[model samples]
Target: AQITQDWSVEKLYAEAQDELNSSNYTRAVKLYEILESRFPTSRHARQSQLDTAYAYYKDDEKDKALAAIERFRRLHPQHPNMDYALYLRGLVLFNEDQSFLNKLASQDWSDRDPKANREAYQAFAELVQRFPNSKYAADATARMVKLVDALGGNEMSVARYYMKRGAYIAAANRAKKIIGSYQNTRYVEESLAILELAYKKLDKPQLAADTRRVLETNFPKSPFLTHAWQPDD
Candidate 1:
C-alpha cells in the first residue's frame, strides 16, 4: 500500500509502457489499471487509460480492449486525446474476425461480417470529421477508403450468393446498395453488371438496358455492355 501510494503517475505510465515495449502486454495492462485507480486525475493518467486499451489489444484481449476504449469514450468525450481513443475503437472493430485471406484476396467467397467493418468506418469517419487536423486523421482517412471498398465487395459477394440461390430480387437490391452506399469504390463496375444481370434474370429488360447504359457511359470499355450475362472481368 505504501509503495503503491508513492508511485508517481509518470513512473506508473512509464513502467507499463516499458512492459508493453517488451511485449509483456498483460503486465502493462495491470500496471496501467493500477495507475488509473491510484491517480486517475494525474497528468499521465489519461494516456495511461489509452495505453491500457492498446495493451489489451496487443495481448489479444479483444473484449477488454473494446471495453477500455468504450470507457475512455464515455468518460472523456472532450479529452484532447479523443482522436486516439476513437482510432483505437475503430481498430478493434476493423480487426475483429479479420482473416489474412479476406485482407489479401478482397473478393473471396468466405463470408465477411460487415458489422464490424461498418462500425470501424463510422468511427474513423467521425474522427476525421470532428478533428480534421488530428495526427490520426490521415491514416484514418486512408483506412476509411479501404473499408468502403471492402464493404462494396462484401455487398457484391452477398449479391452473387443471392443470384446463385435464385434470389434475383435480393441480388438486385444488394447490388443497388453497393451503388448507393459504396460509391467511388472499386466494386461499382461489378455492381452495375450484377444489377443488370439480376434485372434480366427477373425479366425486366428495361431495367437491364438502363443499367447497361449507365455501365457503358461510365465504362465504355466494359465487356459487360454487349450482354447482361457477362462473366467475371
Candidate 2:
C-alpha cells in the first residue's frame, strides 16, 4: 500500500502536544502558529493560538507574550478566553517594571514624572476589576494599593517642597488635598502635619486649629500632631 500524503487536524494537534510536553516550547509555539495560520477554519485554531501564547509566556519571552495577547484580542474579540488575554497583558506590564523597582525606590519622587504612578495604578486596577477571578487579580490589587500610597507620598513630598520655600499657602492647599483625597493612605499623618504648619505660617489660625483637631482625632498617637504647631518652641 502507498503512503497517503493527507494529514488530519488531530495529527497536527498531536505533534504540537508532543513538542509542548517535551518542553520544546519554541518548537511547540511554531507548530501551533502554523496550525492556526493554515487551518483558520478549524476548531483547534483558537486553542492553537492560545497554546502558542502560553508557550511564549512559559519560555519567558515577555515581548512575544504581549504580541501574542494583542493578536489574540484583535483576532478573537468575542473568544471565551478574552479574559485570559487581558489578564496576561496586565501581568506582563506588572512584571516589566521589576528592572526599575530599585531605581524607583531610590530616586527622588520630585525628579520623577508625577503621572507615572497614576498610570500604573490604572493598569493594575483594570486587571483586578475585569478579571476578578484571575490568579493575577490578587497581585494586581496589592500593586494598586501601593501605587495609591505612592501617589499620596508624592503629594506630601510636593507639599513639603512648597513649605521649605515659604510658599505656605500653596503648601497648605497641597496638604489639604492629600488629607481629603488620599485620606486612607499612610501619608495622611504627614499631610495633616504639613497642613497645620502651613496654615499657621500663613496666619490662618482657625484652619490650623481645625486641621490639628482632625489629625489628633484620626492619628491620636501621631508624633506629627505633637510637633506640628510648635516649630519655634
Candidate 3:
C-alpha cells in the first residue's frame, strides 16, 4: 500500500482550529506556525500569527509571547486586531516580573544599581497612556501609584541608612529630596526627622529651625515633632 500526504494549507488550518477548540494550545501553536510559514500570504496567516502569540501567553512564555505580538504588529500594523496585540504586549510586560512590587518596596537606591522600578513604571505608564480604553489600563494606573510609593520608600530607606552612619550631609540631602519630590509618601514623618537631625549635626541651625517649623506645622502630632526645638541662633 502507498501512503498519500494531504498537507494542504486548508487541511492544516482546519486541524489547528480543531486543536485550539479542544484546548490543545501547544499543538495548535505548532501547526499554526507551520501554516503561516508555508502560506505567509494566505488570509489565515494573520489569525495564525495572533493565535500563536496567544498560545505562548497561555503557556506562560512571556518573552516569546511578546516577540510574537511584536512580529504581528510589524506584519499587520493596520489589522483590526492590532489593538488586541498591543494590549497583550503591554499586559505581558507588566506582569512579567511578579516580584516587581516587592522590589519596588525594598530596593536600595544608595548603591546606585540599575533599578527594576523604573522599568516597571515605564511599562505600566505606557499601557495607561497609550491604551486608556483597554481593560488593563485601570489596573496599570493603580499599580503605578503603588510603584511611586515604593520609589519614595526606597529613598527614605537610604536617608535613614545615611543617618545611622552619621553621614549627616548625605542624609539631609536625601531627606530633602524625599520631602520635595515624595511629599505624599508614608515615610514623610521619618524623612523630616532625619532632615532636622542632619541639619543640626551639620551646624546649620537656621535650616534646622526652619525644618522644625515645617515639621511642627505639617505633622503636629508626629513623634518627629516632639523633640523639635529652635536651634541656637
Candidate 4:
C-alpha cells in the first residue's frame, strides 16, 4: 500500500527473493505473483515464476508447485532453464509414492508400486537423453538407476514373502518378474536360484536342472548356490 506508484518491478522481485531466502514461502509466492502481474514481460517476472514454484515445493504446496512447473513448461518452451525445470518436476513425482515405511526406517519393501516411480523415471530419462551436457543430466541418470534397482528390490521382497508362505508358484512368478523386468538388478542371482527351487518343488526336474546350470555358469561361487531361493535359509 505504501509507495505503490513508485514500486519498481526490480524492487518487488528483490522483496520476493528476500522472503524466499528467509523461508517465508507463502509471502514469497504472493510477491512473485504481484511482480508477474505488474510486469508480465520483465525478466524478473520470468525468473520469479520458477522461483515461486520452488518456494511452493519447500512450503508443502507440492501439487501447486507441480502445476506451476507444468505451466512454465507449456508457456516457455525455449526457457534457458528447461532442464532444471524438468528435473524439479520429476523430483516431485518421484517422491509422490514414497510410503511412510520408507521414512520409518523399519521397512524395506515400501516402494512396491511402480506408478509414480515409472512416471518419474520417464521424465528424468527425457532430461538425460535430450540434454546430456546439462548439469542436471548426471543426477537424472543416477536417479534413474536407483529407481530401477528399487523396483527390482520390491519384486524381490514380494518373492521372499510368497516363499515364506509356502507359495512356491507365486514366489517363482514374482521372482520371474524381477528377472524379466530387471535383469541387471541386484537380485538376479537370487531370482535364478528361486526359479530353480520353485521348479524343483513343482516337479519340473528338467527346468530346475537347467536353472542350476545357468546359475553355475554366471555366478559360479554364489552363496545362493549354497543357499538359494528367497526364503530358503
Candidate 5:
C-alpha cells in the first residue's frame, strides 16, 4: 500500500531481512525485488537474488526458488555466495522429493521417478565437492548420505520384486547396482544377501560361494549367516 520511496539499498536490505526473520516471506520477496530494481548495478542487487531464492524456498514456492537460484548462479558464476546458493538449490529439491513422498504415502512409493531425489543429491554432491570447507558442507554431506540410502531403497524394492518373481538374473543385477553405487547405504547388507541368493537360484555354485564369502567377510553378524541357502521362503 505505502511506498518505500526514500529507502536506500541498506535500508531496503535491512527491511527485507527483517521481514524474512519475522516469517513474512511474501513481504521479504517484495522488498528484495525493490532492492534489486533500485540498485541494479550494486552488490546488494546480486545479494537480493540469493535472498529472494531463500525467501521463495521458505515460502514453499519451489519453482520460483529454483528460478531465482538459477538466475543468481547464471549471473554471478564467481559470486561469494555460490556455496549457499548450491545448498539452497539442493534443499529445495530435497524438500520437493519429501513432499512428493508424503503425498505418495497415502497410496504408495515405487512408482515415483526419484528425479527430484537424484537432482538433490547431485546439487549437494557438487556443493560438498566444490566447497568442502564451507559451513554448509556438513549438512549437505549428511543429506547426501541420506539420499544414498533412499536411492538404494528405491533399487532394493525392484530387486525384491524380481526375487519374488523368480527373475534371478534381474534380481542379481539389481542387487549388484545397489552394492556398487550405494555401498555405504544399509541396503548393501541386503544387497549382498540378495546377490548370493540370486546366484544360488541361478545354479552358479562358484559365483554363489564367492558372493557368500564376500557377504560373510563384510557382514559377519548378518542373520543370513546362520541359515544355509534354501528355496523356501
Candidate 6:
C-alpha cells in the first residue's frame, strides 16, 4: 500500500514502460490504466493512452489496440504525436494475419485478400501526407512501396490465373487494371505483356497489335517484346 501510494504520474508511467519493454504487457496495461485513471489531465496520462494501445498490441489484443488508437485520435486530433499515432495504427493493421510471417518467409502477398494491406497503406499514406517531416514518414514510405508491389502482385496473380484458365477476356481486364492502377509497379511490364497475349488468344488481331506497340513503347527492352506472335511480312 505504501509503494502504491508513492506512485506519482512519472513513476507510474516509467514503471508501465518498464513492464512494457520487459514484455509484461498485461502488467504494463494495468499500470497505464492506473496512471490514466489517477491523473486523467496530466501529460503523463495522455501519453499513457498511447502506451496502453501499444501494450494491447504487444499483448496480441489487436481489436483493443485499434480501438484505443482510434480513441487517442478522436481525443487528440491536433496532438504533436498524431503522426506517431497514425504510424502505430498502420503498423497494427499492417501486421494483420500473415503479414509478419510473410515478411519472415520473404514471399509475395499474391494470394491474400489484400484488404488489410489496403487499409494499412491508407493509414500510412495519411501520415506521410499530413506529417511529411515526421520521423516515421521515411518508414511509412518504405512500407508504402512494398504495399504497392503486393497490390500489383495481387492483380498479376489473378491475371495469370485467368490466362491459364483460358479466360482471355477476364485476363485482359485484370492486366489492364494493373496497368492503370499499378503503373509504378514492376508488374506493369508483365501486365502489358499478358494483355498482349490475352488479346492474341482472343483473336483480336488489331487489338493485339495495338497492345504490343504499347508494351514495346513502355518497355522497350521487355523480354516478351519479341516477334514470335506477329508474322513477318
Q: Which regions of candidate 5 fall more than 4 Å away from where they truly are?
A: 1-4, 96-113, 228-233
Candidate 1 lDDT: 0.69
lDDT score at residue 144, model 6, on the 0-100 scale: 89
In model 3, where do residues sit more than 4 Å from their true spots? 1-28, 38-63, 79-87, 94-114, 227-233
Residue pairs with colliding backbones in model 1 are none
lDDT of 3 by residue, 147-195 (tens): 7776777776666666667787677667767777787669887777777
User: For candidate 2, lDDT tens digit of each residue in 68-148?
Assistant: 667767776777667666655554544433344375665433334556566556766666666568545566677677667
Tens digit of per-residue lDDT, candidate 5, span 107-186: 33334568887877777767767876976656666767777767777887777777777888787777766776676666
TM-score of each: 0.78, 0.65, 0.66, 0.85, 0.77, 0.85
Q: For each predicted model, how many residue pairs clash, with residues at least 3 apart or on different chains?
A: 0, 0, 0, 0, 0, 0
- Local distance difference test scores for all models: 0.69, 0.65, 0.66, 0.71, 0.71, 0.70
Worst 10 residues of 5 by lDDT: 101-110
Which 10-residue span in candidate 3 carries the lowest summed lDDT? 105-114
- For candidate 1, give the lDDT of residue 121: 71
Candidate 1 vs candidate 2: the lDDT winner is 1
Query: For candidate 1, lDDT tens digit of each residue in 1-233?
Result: 23355666667667766777787766555666676676567646567667766665654567866666677668777778787777777876666444465456544422457777777777776777788797765677777777777767777666766767777778777776677767777767766877777787788988778877788789987555665554443
lDDT rank order = 4, 5, 6, 1, 3, 2
Rank by TM-score, descending? 4, 6, 1, 5, 3, 2
